[PDB]
């Protein structure tokens, strides 16, 4: 008896722990659901809906290969392990690493208790191209900025392990344990709100493979010339799959690396450029793990402390307006609406709405981080923290802090004909393009004809940009003054 402990590596292909267990003797595939152990960050409704369907496909797969997935509901995953080994008679437990703060601790506490109880525990790399410790500068120190880190990752002395085949068969230790703990990922209220998700997404590794294929053989070619596109099938849509290890980044990297070689050869410039930007995307995810491991309180504590005494507005209705998409800036409200209704946001809108959150409303970034974590289909602690820290300006490589983006111009850049704003704001569905990104200026006759009553079915800017720059300054004058102490 060997135990395979699945957490966020829901796949049978290129899964090192599983492959090591099959090499060793029969297996008991285990998954333990223990949210309260996740603190302030238990999984949100749409993430849970994804987990529920991803696990079903995982179990279905494992059954095809010979064993079932045993699920356990508990308040302490370690304890559950013990009660599983101490009931099955297993001597080893194989699992794949995780690099988020909450996982880092529980994993150590896990190794200690189990090994110090007579259990062999082995741990592999299932989620990264390279372990964060394998990637370092010539002196041997962790890089402090993305570019230097990514340049090393791409110029390493050795290649990432190549995707392993899933087992061809698995033998299962005590099959009488197959009927285990039912996991409930939805209350009746939520079942209601989740009803459209199955129409747009197919959770699981099988479908993730499908998405990777689709992407590489289609949109990747125009990945680069298509990113100012706000709501189009121009990206991979792999994030939710990536978050639960349903798809191997190593496989992703290998397929992308083959296309790049073929396109370099052909001298297809668009292709190379798109390949480069997409690899930078995979790079950023790898970097979020790097930062979380080399700064264990990164999901709450900022890296740079130069904004330490900054007087962040703690205004509750500023927050509510943001969440409701009642800020007055069309592109910002469209994003909040699409996020609330679908749990999905293109990276540019994520930047647009989180940026408005810290520079215009000037709210604490931990609040935007948490809201995103509860509502995004790909909620990921490391990727969410990294994004918020970068936007707020607490990262070595963030853009200049004293800079406020104009949603009206972002509107012109990312949603030139107002199609995005009109899809997510039906109240503005009749407003012509000349005023779609700044309706508060518009002549009364256009508003009346479109059915828009400023302040009613569409609000006036909750904070003007000019007034915004001014509070930003007044806020800096203050933090500088607080520094003097």
Ligand X SMILES: Cc1cc2nc3c(=O)[nH]c(=O)nc-3n(C[C@H](O)[C@H](O)[C@H](O)COP(=O)(O)OP(=O)(O)OC[C@H]3O[C@@H](n4cnc5c(N)ncnc54)[C@H](O)[C@@H]3O)c2cc1C
Ligand Y SMILES: CC[N+](C)(C)CCCS(=O)(=O)[O-]
**265 annotated binding-site participant:** no
Q: Establish how many alpha carbons lie within 13 A of residue 396's alpha carbon, considering only the half-sphere containing its beta carbon.
A: 9
**162 annotated binding-site participant:** no
Minimal distance in Å, beta carbon 60 to ligand Y?
Answer: 16
- Taking CB positions, which residue lies at the least distance from Mg ion? 232
**348 annotated binding-site participant:** yes
Which segment (200-208, 321-329, 384-392, 433-441) binds ligand Y by CB under 6 A?
200-208
Which segment (316-324, 349-357, 404-412, 441-449) binds ligand X by CB under 6 A?
349-357
Figure out which of the listed residues 177, 210, 229, 423 binds ligand Y, where binding follows CB under 6 A. 210
Which segment (48-56, 98-106, 140-148, 373-381) binds ligand X by CB under 6 A?
373-381
Binding string, 391-420, against Cl ion, x = CB under 5 A? ----------x-------------------
Query: Cα 326 vs. chain centroid, distance in angstroms?
Result: 25
Tokens of 7: 């957490």
Task: Tell me which residues in 263-322 interact with ligand ANP (CB under 6 A).
Answer: 284
Tokens of 115: 């090994």
62 vs 68: CA distance, rounded Å: 6
Taking CA 153 as the corner, what is the angle to CA 148 and CA 154, rounded to the nearest 5 degrees?
Answer: 100
Strand extents, DSSP E, 103-180: 120-124
Label residue 273 exposed, middle or buried (CB < 10 Å: 0-12, 13-18, 19+): middle
322 touches ligand Y by CB under 6 A: no
202 touches ligand Y by CB under 6 A: yes
CA–CA distances in Å: residue 282 to residues 4, 29, 49, 193, 324: 27, 29, 25, 31, 31
**76 annotated binding-site participant:** no
Q: Which residues of 228-265 are buried (b: 16+ CB within 10 A; e: fewer)?
A: ebbbeebbbbbbbbbbbbbbbbbbbbbbbeebbeebee
Tokens of 433: 């393009």
Task: Tell me which residues in 282-341 interact with ligand X (CB under 6 A).
Answer: 282, 284-285, 288
Binding string, 354-393, against Cl ion, x = CB under 5 A? ----------------------------------------
331 contact choice in ligand X, ligand Y, Cl ion, none (CB below 5 to 8 Å, kind-dependent):
none
129 touches ligand X by CB under 6 A: no
- Taking CB positions, which residue lies at the least distance from ligand X? 387
108 vs 452: CA distance, rounded Å: 57
**347 annotated binding-site participant:** yes
**Radius of gyration over alpha carbons of the chain, in Å?**
24
Binding string, 393-412, against ligand ANP, x = CB under 6 A? ----x---------------
Q: Report which of 197, 472, 123 is spatially closest to residue 480, judged by C-alpha positions.
A: 472
Task: Tell me which residues in 140-169 interact with ligand ANP (CB under 6 A).
Answer: 146
202 contact choice in Cl ion, ligand X, ligand Y, none (CB below 5 to 8 Å, kind-dependent):
ligand Y
Q: Which residues of 316-335 are buried (b: 16+ CB within 10 A; e: fewer)?
A: eebbebbbebbbbbbbbbbb
Task: Tell me which residues in 222-251 interact with ligand X (CB under 6 A).
Answer: 235-239, 242-243
410 touches ligand X by CB under 6 A: no
342 touches ligand Y by CB under 6 A: no
Q: In the complex, which residues of this chain contact ligand Y (CB under 6 A)? A: 200-202, 207, 210-211, 233, 237
Annotated binding residues for Mg(2+), written as ranges, equal 226, 229, 232, 234, 346
């Amino acid at each position: 008896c060997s135990i395979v402990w699945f957490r966020r590596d829901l796949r049978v292909e290129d899964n090192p722990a599983l492959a090591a267990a099959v090499r060793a003797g029969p297996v008991i595939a285990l998954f333990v659901w223990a949210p309260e152990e996740e603190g302030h960050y238990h999984p949100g409704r749409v993430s849970r809906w994804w987990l529920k369907n991803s696990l079903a496909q995982l179990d279905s797969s494992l059954r095809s290969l010979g064993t079932c997935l045993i699920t356990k509901r508990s308040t302490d995953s370690v304890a559950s392990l013990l009660d599983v080994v101490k009931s099955t008679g297993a001597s080893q437990i194989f699992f794949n690493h995780l690099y988020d703060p909450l996982s880092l601790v529980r994993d150590h506490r896990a190794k200690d208790v189990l090994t110090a109880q007579g259990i062999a525990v082995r741990s592999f790399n299932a989620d990264l191209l390279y372990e964060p410790w394998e990637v370092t500068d010539e002196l041997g120190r962790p890089f402090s900025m993305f570019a230097a880190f990514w340049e090393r990752c791409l110029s390493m002395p050795y290649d990432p392990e190549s995707p392993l085949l899933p087992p061809k068969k698995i033998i299962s230790g005590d099959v009488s344990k197959c009927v285990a703990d039912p996991l409930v990922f939805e209350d009746d209220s939520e079942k209601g709100s989740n009803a459209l998700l199955a129409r747009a997404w197919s959770p699981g590794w099988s479908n993730g493979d499908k998405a990777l294929t689709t992407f590489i053989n289609g949109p990747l070619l125009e990945y680069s010339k298509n990113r100012r596109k706000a709501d189009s099938a121009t990206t991979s849509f792999l994030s939710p799959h990536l978050h639960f290890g349903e798809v191997s980044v190593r496989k992703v990297f290998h397929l992308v690396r083959i296309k790049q070689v073929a396109w370099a050869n052909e001298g297809n410039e668009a292709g190379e450029e798109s390949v480069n930007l997409f690899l930078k995307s995979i790079g950023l995810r790898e970097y979020s793990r790097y930062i979380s491991f080399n700064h264990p309180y990164s999901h709450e504590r900022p890296l740079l402390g130069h904004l330490k005494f900054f007087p962040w507005a703690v205004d509750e209705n500023y927050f509510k307006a943001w969440r409701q998409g009642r800020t007055g800036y069309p592109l910002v409200d469209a994003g909040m609406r699409e996020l609330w209704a679908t749990g999905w946001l293109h990276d540019r809108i994520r930047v647009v709405v989180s940026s408005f959150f810290v520079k215009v409303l000037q709210l604490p970034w931990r609040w935007g981080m948490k809201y995103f974590w509860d509502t995004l289909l790909d909620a990921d602690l490391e990727s969410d923290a990294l994004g918020w820290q970068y936007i707020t300006g607490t990262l070595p490589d963030s853009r200049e802090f004293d800079r406020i983006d104009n949603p009206q111009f972002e509107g012109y850049k990312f949603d030139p004909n107002g199609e995005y704003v009109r899809r997510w704001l039906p109240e503005l569905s009749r407003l012509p393009t000349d005023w779609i990104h700044h309706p508060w200026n518009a002549p009364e006759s256009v508003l009346q004809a479109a059915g828009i009553e400023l302040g009613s079915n569409y609000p006036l800017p909750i904070v003007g940009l000019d007034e915004a720059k001014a509070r930003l300054h007044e806020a800096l004058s203050q933090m500088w003054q607080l520094e003097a102490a």
